Ligand binder design. Sequence first.
Ligand SMILES: *C(=O)[C@H](CO)[C@H](O)CCCC[C@@H](C)C/C(C)=C/C(C)=C/C(=O)O
Ligand SMILES: *C(=O)[C@H](CO)[C@H](O)CCCC[C@@H](C)C/C(C)=C/C(C)=C/C(=O)O
Lengths: 404, 404
Amino acid sequence: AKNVGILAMDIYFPPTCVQQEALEAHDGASKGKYTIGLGQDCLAFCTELEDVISMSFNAVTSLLEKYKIDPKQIGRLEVGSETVIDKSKSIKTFLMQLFEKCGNTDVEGVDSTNACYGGTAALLNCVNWVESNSWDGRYGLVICTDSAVYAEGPARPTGGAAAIAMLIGPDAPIVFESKLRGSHMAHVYDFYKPNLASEYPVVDGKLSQTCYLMALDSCYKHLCNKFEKLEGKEFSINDADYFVFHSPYNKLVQKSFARLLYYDAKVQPTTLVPKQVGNMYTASLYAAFASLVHNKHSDLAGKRVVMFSYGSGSTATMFSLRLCENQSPFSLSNIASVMDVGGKLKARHEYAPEKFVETMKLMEHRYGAKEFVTSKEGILDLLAPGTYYLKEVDSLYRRFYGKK
Amino acid sequence: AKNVGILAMDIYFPPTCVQQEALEAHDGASKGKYTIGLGQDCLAFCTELEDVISMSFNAVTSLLEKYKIDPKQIGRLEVGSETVIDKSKSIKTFLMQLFEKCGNTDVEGVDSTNACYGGTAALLNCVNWVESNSWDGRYGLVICTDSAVYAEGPARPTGGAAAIAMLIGPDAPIVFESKLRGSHMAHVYDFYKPNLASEYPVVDGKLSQTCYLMALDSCYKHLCNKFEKLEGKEFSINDADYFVFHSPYNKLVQKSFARLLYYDAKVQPTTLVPKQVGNMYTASLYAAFASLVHNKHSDLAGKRVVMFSYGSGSTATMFSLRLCENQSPFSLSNIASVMDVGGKLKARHEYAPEKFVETMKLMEHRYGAKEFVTSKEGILDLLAPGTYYLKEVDSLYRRFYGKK
Ligand SMILES: *C(=O)[C@H](CO)[C@H](O)CCCC[C@@H](C)C/C(C)=C/C(C)=C/C(=O)O
Ligand SMILES: *C(=O)[C@H](CO)[C@H](O)CCCC[C@@H](C)C/C(C)=C/C(C)=C/C(=O)O
């Protein structure tokens, strides 16, 4: 099992969105409070028809269909998220629905949690599984999936939603440099969700500030130590071609890279999807990476891409990747083609801020609700053909999905 | 990295408990409804002073102190559970508290969830991490931790609480047979917690019945296929010395082994702690294993121990272990000594059923509560010296712990 990493990749985000500038006007906010202060342009959100589960079906289905992967060929499936549907039943069990009507039930892995890190945790687990004595010769599959509902308050411009699927195995175009990494993990009360009934976090801004920079510094310093062992020198900004970050809002990206000290060369091409879609939590780092493949796929072979994953609480890892052109279907070039990031941004559907706010109120009401049917007219029409959607939640909280 | 598996092990459960027979009398129940119907003898529960976090500190502290492990020597720490304290902040971040005042913050891993499987998922992840190219030479550490609150109804005799800590690395006394395994994973609505506000599950008994047996059968059949490849024959009950099961209640253990078709030889010594402590969810399989080491440590070298992990939803894995006597501190003999299962059962403190029920009411009230100080008189006296306990939860849901 050699050159293990990401073989294939896809992204889904809901087509429904609201413009940050329009939102500034609708709110009390002075010009550029979101577009400049946050550095964000557009916000994708889930309507009543979409959730972290349906988004996951879209992403996994698309990957398997487009890279032509046989479902029997998946041996480990793992999900990273902080969007809790059930306190017992993992998002992973839902995803097994896709694997039953071809009889592939022997599939390791479950859900991994810590804030916007769980996707990273799951990815590392799969890479390790491919390299282990237990490996059965099959692909791993990692999903990152998250969605935010803030109907009110200062949090509301900071939401977003997506799902990412990544195929893992040997001889990849996106190879992990196994030892080029640094982690930092601590017990902090910086940004957390201690109110089971509520989606609203408890945020300690000043401590969040200190704890994030401490992690980034420490992760950086530890990667540098391992670089010194690996290649015989200190690691600097010059020792990678690109830096990709957890990107809840673009201003954090700017500060973070600055802290490492170029941005136009090394970081700017990672900003497309995060800036247009919003905070994607566990999927944010990977959407930033997806933007890089989209923008630069023809320049990426031979290059080093450094990746920094954060999650409040806190858990962080900086790690490194070596990219090369390979053979289709698992090539940098085929990955860009399949993701069709440009096609997905054109296919979007904009909401006036008021209709966005109404939809957010609705989402508040449905959160923890049971025994309801979703309302489809005018919304279902906006979803791409084939899209999984929520039809109803029964009186026992069971969720039933449709396709189209 | 060879002969990877469990190097060292410890268990903590709260010393406070209620007798199943006394409980039958207190409830409407006819003689032997719990002791025979469930096959259970005693029930350990957390009082206001103890939770999955404090129990985890007890287990990890004890392992590191008693097997004399240096905290800097842990490279990956993972937690399995279905007891949700926060929807963002993992139990793992809490545990990092132990690693800061010696500066070991570079520690991979987070929380793994699916029902009473998450501990297994986490264990597999660590074994894989030791065998991966990313492995840095250090120990992995796995925690399983869970606690139940049922103040009312038919669920109430079926609770329990514990935490288990397992040290992972090469040259172990408890070696994984990498390929001797079978998993089964499906999308079922059998036993789940869809009500974020509530601890009470939704149970579909008849479907739970069918889905559990399907998993056990399928896991079994897949392990048999891999056995045929590995050793050239079909796997039968005769091809292992012991079978250890997820053990929420002892009657499930009896049926499950019967389904594989001896019990007195192969399964009976795995029943001590589960029967005295109750349902330990993610830690239950491993407490059953701990009981086996306790009872049979001097017979275990050379033997095969088959292990079956279940979690509703559903996720299952049957896997196999090869045990041998090794060198202290990581010997079957030293592990039995350190766990002192006999010492812990003698040190217990019994509650009349009424006082148990009052304590359960209290736990209902504190669940999701903030801004309270715990009441200590009469309870703190019952905890072993050194025990971590909850002092208070502040107005921002932060939890503060004491020791003693
Ligand atoms: C994910 O773990 C979490 C929400 O679930 C979130 O996306 C990551 C936390 C982001 C922390 C910022 C809110 C605070 C931060 C450190 C901003 C700073 C330091 C930028 C700067 O100018 O320094
Ligand atoms: C853990 O995943 C879960 C609670 O969190 C629980 O401990 C495991 C589910 C146990 C399922 C039983 C309640 C149903 C069962 C199949 C009993 C049977 C089949 C025994 C028998 O006689 O067959």
